[PDB]
Amino acid sequence: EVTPIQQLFLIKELKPGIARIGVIWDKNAANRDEVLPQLQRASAATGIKVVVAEVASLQEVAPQFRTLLRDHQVEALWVLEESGLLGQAAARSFLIKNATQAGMPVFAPSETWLKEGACVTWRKDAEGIRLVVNKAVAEAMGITIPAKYQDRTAFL
Ligand SMILES: [Hg+2]
CA 4 to chain centre: 10
Interval between CA 141 and ligand 1 midpoint (Å): 7
Between the CA of 95 and the centroid of ligand 1 the distance, in Å, is: 10
Residue 113 neighbours by CB under 8 Å, 6+ apart: 79, 92, 96, 106, 121
Q: How many angstroms separate the alpha carbon of residue 29 from the centre of ligand 1? A: 23
C-alpha to C-alpha distance for 45 and 37, rounded to whole angstroms: 12
Instruction: Kindly list the distances between the CA atom of residue 144 and the CA atoms of 12, 14, 129, 148, in Å, as whole numbers in the listed order.
Output: 10, 5, 17, 11
Distance 151 CA to ligand 1 centre (A): 22
Q: How was this structure determined?
A: X-ray
Distance 12 CA to ligand 1 centre (A): 16
**Dist. CA 103 → ligand 1 center (Å):** 7
The structural domains of the chain, ordered by start, are: 4-155 (3.40.50.2300)
Handedness of CA 84, 104, 22, 54 (dihedral sign): negative
Residue 54 vs residues 28, 44, 46, 149: alpha-carbon distances, Å: 9, 20, 22, 32
Rounded Cα distance, 152 and 80, in Å: 21
CA–centroid distance, 3 to ligand 1, in Å, is: 21
